[PDB]
Amino acid sequence: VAGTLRLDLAAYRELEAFAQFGSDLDKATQAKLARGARTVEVLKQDLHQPIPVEKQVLIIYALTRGFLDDIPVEDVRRFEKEFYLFLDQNGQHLLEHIRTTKDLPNEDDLNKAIEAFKKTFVVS
Amino acid sequence: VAGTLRLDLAAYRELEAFAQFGSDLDKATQAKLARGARTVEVLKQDLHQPIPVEKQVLIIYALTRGFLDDIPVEDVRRFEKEFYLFLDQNGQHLLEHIRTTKDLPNEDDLNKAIEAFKKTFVVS
Amino acid sequence: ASLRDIKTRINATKKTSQITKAMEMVSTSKLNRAEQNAKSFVPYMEKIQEVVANVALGAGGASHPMLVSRPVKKTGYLVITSDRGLAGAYNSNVLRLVYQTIQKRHASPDEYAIIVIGRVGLSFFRKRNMPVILDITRLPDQPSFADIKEIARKTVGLFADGTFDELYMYYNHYVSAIQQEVTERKLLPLTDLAENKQRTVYEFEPSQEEILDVLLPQYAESLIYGALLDAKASEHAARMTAMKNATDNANELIRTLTLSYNRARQAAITQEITEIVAGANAL
Amino acid sequence: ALAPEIVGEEHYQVARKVQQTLQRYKELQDIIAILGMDELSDEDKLVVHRARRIQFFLSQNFHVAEQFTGQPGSYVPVKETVRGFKEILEGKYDHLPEDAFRLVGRIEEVVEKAKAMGV
Amino acid sequence: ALAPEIVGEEHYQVARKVQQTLQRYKELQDIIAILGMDELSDEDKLVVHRARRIQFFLSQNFHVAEQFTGQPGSYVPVKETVRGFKEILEGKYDHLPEDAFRLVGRIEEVVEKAKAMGV
């Protein structure tokens, strides 16, 4: 899941400098900026708040698959917090699978769970 | 000849940095940039190809007197090479006069020889 | 800071100053070109004004001067801006004035309309979603009549069809090389034709209701160019002033950075020699 | 001592917002230094608008400083400080001149001296 | 060893031309930053278009880099890379995206990756 994030940030490195004075008409660059801002806001964390790797993998997967591409940056911070509770409530079997075998579970079940959460999250 | 060459190169260098879009400022600036580029092309030299002082005098005279002002900057090196390969065949009197008297030859003869070479030099 | 950091800052500021000086020279040339182009066509405007003043009498059957097409309706707004920035407050002043006047002159987005010249105004009204009808962006920096005759004809047609009761235009007016003034000019309905001296019907008039009807699209083109001949000059003057200021600021920054660099260089030499001598006499 | 469990959540968020705006203004200062405020975006101009007023409102008149200038000093409670900075951050005072924020106590004195010098 | 008599005349010429193109690309970045690409000429736009592709094509995938990337490495012959750079300077691949040249190897891999991405 984390191979794409290096380049997702790396593009943002230059796009932030260019966007301050560029024309900003390319929708591809706009999507790059939208992904970069969201991943930057996701990487934030509060003091003395540990997160298990089984949930880190899933939040990174949700971010990198594009499921967060519609959630606003003002809301992704609370989106992750609610997603942890929802995952503990329903998707616990996926967490057990990741804890037992280090590989990701089957994509379709994970996508279904993420969609089921997105259809319950409230957007401000 | 160095008195004119130095002034031309200094004039080009004092405004070279503006050349990309400082063009079309005036006819005076256009000629200065055009002759400065050709001067820079003339001052190029190969790794182990020294040339006699008489040939240097001829080429600097041709540049300064404006005989290069209608040759594109992409062919100045070929112009120099062919000019030497023409001088050693025809301008023997000019070369010998320079080597013997340390002075320039007759300006009319110099102009005649330069035009004779120029009418046979292929543009590109 | 480090010597390398200060030297890199100095080099970057010097190259920026070079760019800005070249741009200022280009703008200074363009300003004179536009001033000549604007001053050239004064006699044509005078002639058309004189003809209109002679002919605008009797019934005045043309709809444009006589009456407002609707007592209350959408009001057309024509704005003239640049295609690219670095011109200072040239675009910002006009856009601010237009926005402030329309926010309290109109209450609904179907109570007005906007026609815009320039990419920056288009971007402004796209970001601040507002009703815009048509626009033109790509334009030579020495405009002529044929370049915008089609958009002038189209906006005249929109006014004549009854889409706008009134029509104003907003642009920058050139007062001096330093001062640019935003000007509100009411275009239609035609009201302020003061009387003149020249003989009426200088040649036999086939019909007032036909001569005025044919002539009024042309008079409005004499009023639209009178705008693009002044806005262009104001834009070039504003660019020249902005680049002059930027070059001066860059020069001052270079001077201060050079002072700091000299202090750092002296401090580094002193520290190195002091450490050398301490190590040498520590034995 | 600047922790959410020590000073309060609203105090912590106000302080963090003020620091964020000041950092953004510090970043922009380099560009405004050369080419002025005209080439900034609509967001950055608002950032500068808020940041200058916040920076001026951080000033205060001291009781000790009465010898240096005739104005007497002011003691500002922390709740008043937090409320005033929150109100400034919310944009309640963008129409007041920035000179009205210099060397005052509570946020009310800014309004009072803005009214004294104009509206 | 970069001399015509040692490395070959065409190799020396293409290498020096690539070097000149990259150096000219370095000369345009300040102008691009301050003005945008709109102020460039049609030829200089082409120069930047080709220079970015050349710079990305200078990258390669290493066999020992599998531990950091996953993808296997490749070995590129000198004649193959000379021909590929000559073709890129000729413009046979201007239509392909710049990122199609990242960490690829041969032009036969550039075209394959461009086809794979579905452009």
PDB file of C-alpha atoms in Angstrom, chain D residues 60-66 71-74:
ATOM      1  CA  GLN D  60       0.028  45.805  24.639  1.00  0.00           C
ATOM      2  CA  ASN D  61       0.440  48.941  26.746  1.00  0.00           C
ATOM      3  CA  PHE D  62       2.320  48.327  29.992  1.00  0.00           C
ATOM      4  CA  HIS D  63       1.880  50.032  33.348  1.00  0.00           C
ATOM      5  CA  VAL D  64       5.659  50.488  33.542  1.00  0.00           C
ATOM      6  CA  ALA D  65       5.783  52.009  30.047  1.00  0.00           C
ATOM      7  CA  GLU D  66       3.657  54.988  31.147  1.00  0.00           C
ATOM      8  CA  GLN D  71      -1.030  56.072  27.847  1.00  0.00           C
ATOM      9  CA  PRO D  72      -1.659  54.040  31.029  1.00  0.00           C
ATOM     10  CA  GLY D  73      -1.266  50.285  31.209  1.00  0.00           C
ATOM     11  CA  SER D  74      -3.814  47.501  30.857  1.00  0.00           C
TER      12      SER D  74
END
